[PDB]
Amino acid sequence: KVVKFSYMWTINNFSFCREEMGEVIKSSTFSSGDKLKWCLRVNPKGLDEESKDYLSLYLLLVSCPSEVRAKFKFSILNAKGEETKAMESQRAYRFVQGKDWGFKKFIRRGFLLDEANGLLPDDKLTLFCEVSVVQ
Amino acid sequence: PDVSSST
């Protein structure tokens, strides 16, 4: 079977983030409604030297009573609430409690942070995550 | 897209 669910994460005052390379912000936890708890994690200035040009974005399995397999998709919502710049795992990945999977090079900082592209209305970054858990 | 882990 499959259980599909989503979480929308609004990061307020995004331009004010002081996170340096490798520093992370995690979201509140979410679930399908569920013994599992997930959260999102973003590195606004990338995870590492290779990704310092990018936001790195991950799905974390926070609490899980030995393993689960899950496909995931992350996107950015524009001002109209439409999904843009989506990236989706080509397959399901194996999560254990405390394990994350994601995209180290999710979106170019030079793109997201340029006001002309309009993806930070009211200085808010809105990310949307869809997860499909294999049961 | 390249999927990886930070944990």
Side-chain angles (χ1 to χ4, degrees), chain A residues 3-49 51-114 116-135, chain B residues 1 3-7:
Chain A
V3 177
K4 196 177 177 160
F5 60 101
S6 65
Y7 184 68
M8 192 197 80
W9 187 20
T10 302
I11 304 179
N12 299 305
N13 315 304
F14 189 71
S15 78
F16 286 82
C17 285
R18 292 169 298 171
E19 282 71 23
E20 290 157 28
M21 178 182 321
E23 289 185 334
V24 67
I25 310 168
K26 79 180 172 185
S27 73
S28 293
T29 55
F30 63 94
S31 65
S32 61
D34 198 342
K35 295 185 287 289
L36 305 203
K37 297 303 179 174
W38 305 80
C39 77
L40 302 180
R41 291 172 93 181
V42 67
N43 301 94
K45 279 189 173 191
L47 183 70
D48 58 24
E49 188 61 32
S51 51
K52 70 171 182 193
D53 349 68
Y54 293 83
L55 273 68
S56 305
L57 177 59
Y58 303 88
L59 176 62
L60 173 62
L61 182 52
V62 169
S63 183
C64 183
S66 69
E67 79 192 44
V68 289
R69 302 216 131 73
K71 293 177 179 198
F72 55 92
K73 171 189 149 192
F74 306 139
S75 60
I76 300 169
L77 301 189
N78 64 21
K80 277 179 267 181
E82 301 171 323
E83 293 170 12
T84 184
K85 314 294 172 169
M87 287 194 177
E88 186 188 43
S89 69
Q90 290 313 110
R91 55 172 181 88
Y93 281 76
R94 181 190 174 260
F95 292 80
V96 304
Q97 180 165 115
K99 178 63 159 178
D100 79 18
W101 286 106
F103 306 107
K104 203 165 74 173
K105 297 174 185 181
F106 177 66
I107 193 169
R108 228 172 259 284
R109 288 176 45 76
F111 170 75
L112 179 63
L113 291 168
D114 195 296
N117 302 135
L119 295 186
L120 300 170
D122 296 304
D123 198 19
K124 299 179 191 310
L125 173 60
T126 300
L127 300 169
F128 186 67
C129 174
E130 299 170 76
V131 184
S132 302
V133 166
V134 186
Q135 288 177 5
Chain B
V3 173
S4 65
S5 172
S6 72
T7 45

PDB file of all heavy atoms in Angstrom, chain A residues 118-133:
ATOM      1  N   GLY A 118      10.369  36.852  -7.421  1.00  0.00           N
ATOM      2  CA  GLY A 118       9.139  36.938  -6.637  1.00  0.00           C
ATOM      3  C   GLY A 118       8.789  35.759  -5.760  1.00  0.00           C
ATOM      4  O   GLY A 118       7.622  35.605  -5.388  1.00  0.00           O
ATOM      5  N   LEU A 119       9.781  34.930  -5.409  1.00  0.00           N
ATOM      6  CA  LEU A 119       9.527  33.724  -4.610  1.00  0.00           C
ATOM      7  C   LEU A 119       9.627  33.930  -3.096  1.00  0.00           C
ATOM      8  O   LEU A 119       9.455  32.980  -2.329  1.00  0.00           O
ATOM      9  CB  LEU A 119      10.437  32.577  -5.051  1.00  0.00           C
ATOM     10  CG  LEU A 119      10.179  32.073  -6.478  1.00  0.00           C
ATOM     11  CD1 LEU A 119      11.028  30.853  -6.753  1.00  0.00           C
ATOM     12  CD2 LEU A 119       8.706  31.741  -6.657  1.00  0.00           C
ATOM     13  N   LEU A 120       9.911  35.162  -2.680  1.00  0.00           N
ATOM     14  CA  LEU A 120       9.902  35.521  -1.262  1.00  0.00           C
ATOM     15  C   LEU A 120       8.918  36.669  -0.979  1.00  0.00           C
ATOM     16  O   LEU A 120       9.317  37.721  -0.486  1.00  0.00           O
ATOM     17  CB  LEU A 120      11.319  35.898  -0.794  1.00  0.00           C
ATOM     18  CG  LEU A 120      12.378  34.797  -0.934  1.00  0.00           C
ATOM     19  CD1 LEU A 120      13.779  35.352  -0.683  1.00  0.00           C
ATOM     20  CD2 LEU A 120      12.066  33.597  -0.037  1.00  0.00           C
ATOM     21  N   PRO A 121       7.617  36.461  -1.274  1.00  0.00           N
ATOM     22  CA  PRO A 121       6.679  37.555  -1.020  1.00  0.00           C
ATOM     23  C   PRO A 121       6.553  37.807   0.479  1.00  0.00           C
ATOM     24  O   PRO A 121       6.449  36.847   1.255  1.00  0.00           O
ATOM     25  CB  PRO A 121       5.364  37.030  -1.608  1.00  0.00           C
ATOM     26  CG  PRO A 121       5.480  35.552  -1.529  1.00  0.00           C
ATOM     27  CD  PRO A 121       6.938  35.262  -1.793  1.00  0.00           C
ATOM     28  N   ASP A 122       6.585  39.081   0.876  1.00  0.00           N
ATOM     29  CA  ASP A 122       6.584  39.467   2.295  1.00  0.00           C
ATOM     30  C   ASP A 122       7.778  38.858   3.045  1.00  0.00           C
ATOM     31  O   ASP A 122       7.709  38.631   4.258  1.00  0.00           O
ATOM     32  CB  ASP A 122       5.273  39.040   2.977  1.00  0.00           C
ATOM     33  CG  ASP A 122       4.055  39.743   2.401  1.00  0.00           C
ATOM     34  OD1 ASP A 122       4.032  40.988   2.392  1.00  0.00           O
ATOM     35  OD2 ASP A 122       3.117  39.042   1.966  1.00  0.00           O
ATOM     36  N   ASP A 123       8.847  38.582   2.300  1.00  0.00           N
ATOM     37  CA  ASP A 123      10.065  37.975   2.845  1.00  0.00           C
ATOM     38  C   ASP A 123       9.790  36.595   3.466  1.00  0.00           C
ATOM     39  O   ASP A 123      10.412  36.213   4.466  1.00  0.00           O
ATOM     40  CB  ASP A 123      10.742  38.902   3.861  1.00  0.00           C
ATOM     41  CG  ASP A 123      12.199  38.522   4.113  1.00  0.00           C
ATOM     42  OD1 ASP A 123      12.771  37.809   3.265  1.00  0.00           O
ATOM     43  OD2 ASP A 123      12.756  38.942   5.153  1.00  0.00           O
ATOM     44  N   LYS A 124       8.855  35.862   2.873  1.00  0.00           N
ATOM     45  CA  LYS A 124       8.534  34.509   3.345  1.00  0.00           C
ATOM     46  C   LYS A 124       8.889  33.448   2.305  1.00  0.00           C
ATOM     47  O   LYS A 124       8.533  33.581   1.139  1.00  0.00           O
ATOM     48  CB  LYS A 124       7.047  34.390   3.686  1.00  0.00           C
ATOM     49  CG  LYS A 124       6.591  35.323   4.796  1.00  0.00           C
ATOM     50  CD  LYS A 124       5.088  35.173   5.085  1.00  0.00           C
ATOM     51  CE  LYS A 124       4.589  36.290   6.007  1.00  0.00           C
ATOM     52  NZ  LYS A 124       5.433  36.479   7.231  1.00  0.00           N
ATOM     53  N   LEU A 125       9.581  32.404   2.741  1.00  0.00           N
ATOM     54  CA  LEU A 125       9.867  31.262   1.876  1.00  0.00           C
ATOM     55  C   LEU A 125       8.840  30.194   2.214  1.00  0.00           C
ATOM     56  O   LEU A 125       8.729  29.798   3.369  1.00  0.00           O
ATOM     57  CB  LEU A 125      11.295  30.723   2.101  1.00  0.00           C
ATOM     58  CG  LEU A 125      11.616  29.426   1.342  1.00  0.00           C
ATOM     59  CD1 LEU A 125      11.482  29.618  -0.167  1.00  0.00           C
ATOM     60  CD2 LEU A 125      13.024  28.929   1.663  1.00  0.00           C
ATOM     61  N   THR A 126       8.070  29.759   1.221  1.00  0.00           N
ATOM     62  CA  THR A 126       7.083  28.707   1.461  1.00  0.00           C
ATOM     63  C   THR A 126       7.485  27.449   0.699  1.00  0.00           C
ATOM     64  O   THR A 126       7.548  27.441  -0.537  1.00  0.00           O
ATOM     65  CB  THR A 126       5.655  29.165   1.116  1.00  0.00           C
ATOM     66  OG1 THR A 126       5.324  30.307   1.925  1.00  0.00           O
ATOM     67  CG2 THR A 126       4.646  28.035   1.408  1.00  0.00           C
ATOM     68  N   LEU A 127       7.793  26.405   1.457  1.00  0.00           N
ATOM     69  CA  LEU A 127       8.155  25.105   0.893  1.00  0.00           C
ATOM     70  C   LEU A 127       7.004  24.113   1.070  1.00  0.00           C
ATOM     71  O   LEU A 127       6.254  24.161   2.062  1.00  0.00           O
ATOM     72  CB  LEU A 127       9.422  24.571   1.590  1.00  0.00           C
ATOM     73  CG  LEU A 127      10.682  25.450   1.464  1.00  0.00           C
ATOM     74  CD1 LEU A 127      11.797  24.977   2.388  1.00  0.00           C
ATOM     75  CD2 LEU A 127      11.163  25.476   0.030  1.00  0.00           C
ATOM     76  N   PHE A 128       6.876  23.195   0.124  1.00  0.00           N
ATOM     77  CA  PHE A 128       5.807  22.222   0.176  1.00  0.00           C
ATOM     78  C   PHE A 128       6.404  20.841  -0.029  1.00  0.00           C
ATOM     79  O   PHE A 128       7.154  20.620  -0.976  1.00  0.00           O
ATOM     80  CB  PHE A 128       4.738  22.558  -0.868  1.00  0.00           C
ATOM     81  CG  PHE A 128       3.531  21.689  -0.798  1.00  0.00           C
ATOM     82  CD1 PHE A 128       2.677  21.738   0.309  1.00  0.00           C
ATOM     83  CD2 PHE A 128       3.212  20.827  -1.852  1.00  0.00           C
ATOM     84  CE1 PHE A 128       1.530  20.913   0.374  1.00  0.00           C
ATOM     85  CE2 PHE A 128       2.069  20.016  -1.796  1.00  0.00           C
ATOM     86  CZ  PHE A 128       1.223  20.064  -0.680  1.00  0.00           C
ATOM     87  N   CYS A 129       6.114  19.931   0.890  1.00  0.00           N
ATOM     88  CA  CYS A 129       6.684  18.591   0.847  1.00  0.00           C
ATOM     89  C   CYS A 129       5.547  17.586   0.708  1.00  0.00           C
ATOM     90  O   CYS A 129       4.579  17.664   1.444  1.00  0.00           O
ATOM     91  CB  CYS A 129       7.449  18.317   2.142  1.00  0.00           C
ATOM     92  SG  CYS A 129       8.047  16.634   2.289  1.00  0.00           S
ATOM     93  N   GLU A 130       5.670  16.658  -0.239  1.00  0.00           N
ATOM     94  CA  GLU A 130       4.742  15.547  -0.351  1.00  0.00           C
ATOM     95  C   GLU A 130       5.530  14.269  -0.095  1.00  0.00           C
ATOM     96  O   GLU A 130       6.658  14.118  -0.582  1.00  0.00           O
ATOM     97  CB  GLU A 130       4.100  15.523  -1.726  1.00  0.00           C
ATOM     98  CG  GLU A 130       3.308  16.790  -2.013  1.00  0.00           C
ATOM     99  CD  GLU A 130       2.878  16.872  -3.450  1.00  0.00           C
ATOM    100  OE1 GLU A 130       1.916  16.153  -3.808  1.00  0.00           O
ATOM    101  OE2 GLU A 130       3.508  17.655  -4.208  1.00  0.00           O
ATOM    102  N   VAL A 131       4.957  13.380   0.708  1.00  0.00           N
ATOM    103  CA  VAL A 131       5.635  12.150   1.095  1.00  0.00           C
ATOM    104  C   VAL A 131       4.712  10.990   0.784  1.00  0.00           C
ATOM    105  O   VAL A 131       3.523  11.049   1.087  1.00  0.00           O
ATOM    106  CB  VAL A 131       5.956  12.107   2.607  1.00  0.00           C
ATOM    107  CG1 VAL A 131       6.751  10.841   2.952  1.00  0.00           C
ATOM    108  CG2 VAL A 131       6.745  13.369   3.051  1.00  0.00           C
ATOM    109  N   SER A 132       5.263   9.928   0.201  1.00  0.00           N
ATOM    110  CA  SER A 132       4.504   8.688   0.035  1.00  0.00           C
ATOM    111  C   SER A 132       5.244   7.564   0.746  1.00  0.00           C
ATOM    112  O   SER A 132       6.351   7.191   0.347  1.00  0.00           O
ATOM    113  CB  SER A 132       4.286   8.369  -1.450  1.00  0.00           C
ATOM    114  OG  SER A 132       3.614   9.446  -2.094  1.00  0.00           O
ATOM    115  N   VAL A 133       4.641   7.069   1.822  1.00  0.00           N
ATOM    116  CA  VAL A 133       5.235   6.011   2.638  1.00  0.00           C
ATOM    117  C   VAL A 133       4.768   4.656   2.132  1.00  0.00           C
ATOM    118  O   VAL A 133       3.569   4.423   1.961  1.00  0.00           O
ATOM    119  CB  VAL A 133       4.861   6.158   4.133  1.00  0.00           C
ATOM    120  CG1 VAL A 133       5.179   4.872   4.921  1.00  0.00           C
ATOM    121  CG2 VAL A 133       5.560   7.353   4.743  1.00  0.00           C
TER     122      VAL A 133
END
